[PDB]
Structures are given as structure tokens and as C-alpha cells.
Design a protein around this ligand. Structure first.
Ligand SMILES: OC[C@H]1O[C@@H](O[C@H]2[C@H](O)[C@@H](O)[C@H](O[C@H]3[C@H](O)[C@@H](O)[C@H](O)O[C@@H]3CO)O[C@@H]2CO)[C@H](O)[C@@H](O)[C@@H]1O
Ligand SMILES: OC[C@H]1O[C@@H](O[C@H]2[C@H](O)[C@@H](O)[C@H](O)O[C@@H]2CO)[C@H](O)[C@@H](O)[C@@H]1O
Ligand SMILES: OC[C@H]1O[C@@H](O)[C@H](O)[C@@H](O)[C@@H]1O
Length: 362
């Protein structure tokens, strides 16, 4: 049964061992001792643990086992931050993140199995709180990319999958935030009403459980939480940062029968005004680590600022011959050469460190 208030309150955030290991190896390739020590400070900043392949599901057990042992040893209640990201025909409007599951080859049933495997590890460790981000990009694409044939063909499956994950996770007391795009995707005034409709319907079909806490925004993106000085890339959009986006979405969601809360990714938001076009998302050059994870937010509607996308892990390959090459990853404002999405992109990480705002102290 669900407790009241902000679900992050009074919990220590478990630090990702996978990202810690990656940063450690990134730091070991950096010779400048002031940059090296700065790099190593990042494994101390909480990020979300992505389960983008079904071969990782058992690692959740290992993380929950580890977090439970920390809790027993310290007496400090722990919270593990995870991302559910493996819908069949994933990333239907792009090719950079492409997914192991196909709708043509038993995809929906395989996704159900993937969710059950996550659920079966979570059952093993009930004494630790979990916060989960559900399927980045999926529903966002249903609002704005129904024109794309692959997204149309995936719609039923996306909705069924997200609803299945929500009901299974909410049964086990996991706090969920469904991915809801960003200010430059759904904050456009035409997409605000249909977004509110869709997320409210998902909430309804998943059973209106209080463990379905709200939405996540700006995942794998670079938008400001709050900008005084406008970004000219946002020309035509009147909600040009994440707070305006949330302040315009929340009342509509309420009206559609869901008092949603929010969390906001700020992991690569340190530097604004680094894109020529607002739809440019792939390995954007010159980005920096942004506002640190905090429960001191500018709104009652926002539970937490977080780092969902772990900076340094690539968004997509720039190798034009690769099967998963997306032309957005070869843009002029993209850091090239880039390795496959998910894999370590060292020079990108280094710039994220160098461009950190607030700066990383050694
Ligand atoms: O945020 C990371 C994900 O983004 C993806 O692309 C989306 C862009 O991020 C988003 O800015 C853009 O928004 C469009 C909108 O669809 C349209 O209604 C409006 O008029 O113009 C905007 C242009 O700024 O949409 C795209 C998706 O089509 C990637 O697909 C995804 O892989 C990535 O994780
Ligand atoms: O399996 C490789 C790698 O995936 C990482 O998740 C990626 C995902 O693969 C990518 O498509 C998406 O755009 O970004 C996320 C986060 O970088 C995951 O974090 C790694 O642990 C994993 O090894
Ligand atoms: O600003 C555009 C930048 O794109 C990147 O891919 C390159 O590494 C930079 O040298 C270049 O200037």
C-alpha cells in the first residue's frame, strides 16, 4: 500500500554501480589531476539505472540485494532509480535506439516476459523503495508521430506494454513516472491537449493506483528547468523550458482526471543555447552536466530534479554505414565520431565534465 507525500523524502538514493564503473574507467584515461578528480566526483551523483536489454533484468536483483545490504548495514532507507525501456518496435520515429524486440517476431509476448522478469527480482527484495521511469519516448511519439507508419503500427503495443508495466509494478509497490517527452516536444500548444488526454487514459487503464505518481520530462534531452534568457531555437513555442511545460500540462492533466506529479532530468542541461534546431537530440555538442539531483524544486508539482539519462553514454552512432544510423546523429551540432547508443562516449563525457554547471569541484 502507498505512503503519502513525496516518495523521494527521507531516502538515500542508491548510486548506480554500472555508471560508477564507467566513470572510474573514464577518469583513468584522464591525465590532468584537476579534471580527473572532477570526473570521479560524478559517480557520487545519483543516476537512473537503465534496463534496455532483457539480459540486464537479473542485475536488478543484484542491485536490490546490494541496496538491501547497505540499508541493513547503515540503517538508512534506500531508493533505487530504474528505467523500463524495451518496448517492441522501440523508438518508432528514429533508428539510433532500435530495440531487441520486434512486433513481427513475438514482440508483445517477449516484452511481457521482460516485465515479469523485472517483477520477479523486485519480489525478492521488498524492503527497498524503487522509483521507475516507464518507456522513454513511447507515448510522446503517439501524440506527435502518428504520421510515421512504424509508430501507427506500434500504438496498440506501446499502450498495452506501458499499461502492463504499470499494473505489474504498482502491484509490487514501485513508484512510477511515465515518460512524457519534453518542453520542445509536447509543450507546443497543439500537443498539450492530446498529451493530457493520452496520459490520463493510461493512468485510468492502469487502475489509477497511487504508485503511478506522475510523469518524467526532459529524459535524454538538454532543456533548462527554468530559463530567463530565451533560446532562439524555441521560436514558435511559448513553453520554452521544462517548468513552463509542466505548468501548462499539469492543469490540463488535472482536468482530464489525474493530479499528476513530475520529475525532471537535468543531467545534460548545464549549457543552454547549443542547438540550431530544437528537434536535435543526438549527442549534442558542448552539452554539460546540469542542475544536481535535488528535492528542492521550483513547484509543488515537481517531486524531484534527477539525472535520468547518464551523461557519457552515447545517444547513437555517427557511423553512416551502421544498421542503427540515424541522420540526426550526423548533424552539424552533434559530437562526432559517436559510438553505438548506450556505449561509452569518452570525449563527450569529458566535455560534460568541463562544461558542468554548477561546476564540479575537485
Ligand atoms: O528527447 C530525446 C528523444 O527525442 C526524439 O526526437 C524528438 C525531439 O526530441 C522533439 O524535440 C521533436 O519535437 C517536435 C514535435 O514532434 C512537433 O510536434 C513540433 O511541431 O516540432 C518539434 C520539433 O522541435 O520530436 C522528435 C520526435 O519526432 C528521438 O526520436 C528520441 O530517440 C530521443 O530519445
Ligand atoms: O546495452 C547498452 C547500454 O544501454 C544503456 O541504455 C541506453 C540505451 O541503450 C540507449 O538506447 C538510450 O538512448 O540511452 C540509454 C542510456 O544511456 C544502459 O544505460 C547501459 O548500462 C547499457 O550497457
Ligand atoms: O561546433 C561543431 C563541432 O562539431 C563536433 O562534431 C566537432 O568535434 C567540433 O570540432 C565542431 O566544431
Amino acid at each position: 500500500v502507498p505512503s503519502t507525500g513525496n516518495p523521494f523524502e527521507g531516502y538515500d538514493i542508491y548510486l548506480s554501480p554500472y555508471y560508477a564503473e564507467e566513470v572510474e574507467a573514464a577518469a583513468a584515461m584522464i591525465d590532468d589531476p584537476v579534471l580527473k578528480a572532477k570526473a570521479l566526483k560524478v559517480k557520487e551523483i545519483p543516476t537512473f539505472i537503465w534496463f534496455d536489454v532483457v539480459r540486464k533484468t537479473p542485475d536488478l536483483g543484484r542491485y536490490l540485494a546490494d541496496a538491501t545490504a547497505i540499508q541493513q548495514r547503515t540503517g538508512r532507507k534506500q531508493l533505487v532509480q530504474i528505467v523500463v525501456y524495451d518496448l517492441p518496435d522501440r523508438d518508432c520515429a528514429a533508428a539510433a535506439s532500435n530495440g531487441e524486440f520486434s512486433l513481427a517476431d513475438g514482440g508483445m509476448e517477449k516484452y511481457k516476459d521482460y516485465v515479469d522478469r523485472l517483477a520477479s527480482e523486485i519480489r525478492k527484495y521488498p524492503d527497498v523503495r524503487i522509483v521507475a521511469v516507464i518507456e522513454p519516448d513511447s507515448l510522446a511519439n503517439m501524440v506527435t508521430n502518428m504520421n510515421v507508419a512504424k509508430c501507427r503500427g506500434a500504438e496498440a503495443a506501446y499502450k498495452e506494454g506501458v499499461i502492463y508495466a504499470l499494473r505489474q509494478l504498482s502491484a509490487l509497490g514501485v513508484y512510477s513516472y511515465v515518460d512524457a517527452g519534453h518542453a520542445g516536444w509536447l509543450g507546443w500548444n497543439a500537443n498539450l491537449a492530446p498529451s493530457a488526454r493520452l496520459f490520463a487514459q493510461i493512468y485510468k487503464d492502469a487502475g489509477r493506483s497511487a504508485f503511478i505518481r506522475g510523469l518524467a520530462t526532459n529524459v535524454s534531452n538538454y532543456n533548462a528547468l527554468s530559463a530567463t534568457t530565451r533560446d532562439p531555437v524555441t521560436q514558435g513555442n511559448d513553453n520554452y523550458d521544462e517548468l513552463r511545460f509542466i505548468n501548462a500540462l499539469a492543469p490540463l492533466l488535472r482536468n482530464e482526471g489525474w493530479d499528476a506529479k513530475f520529475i525532471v532530468d537535468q543531467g545534460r542541461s548545464g549549457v543552454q543555447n547549443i542547438r540550431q534546431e530544437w528537434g536535435n537530440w543526438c549527442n549534442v555538442y558542448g552539452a554539460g552536466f546540469g542542475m544536481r539531483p535535488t528535492l528542492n524544486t521550483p513547484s509543488s508539482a515537481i517531486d524531484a530534479i534527477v539525472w535520468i539519462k547518464p551523461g557519457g553514454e552515447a545517444d547513437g552512432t555517427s557511423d553512416t554505414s551502421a544498421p542503427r544510423y540515424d541522420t540526426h546523429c550526423g548533424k552539424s551540432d552533434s559530437h562526432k565520431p559517436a559510438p553505438e547508443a548506450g556505449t561509452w562516449f569518452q570525449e563527450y563525457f569529458v566535455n560534460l565534465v568541463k562544461n558542468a554547471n554548477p561546476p564540479l569541484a575537485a
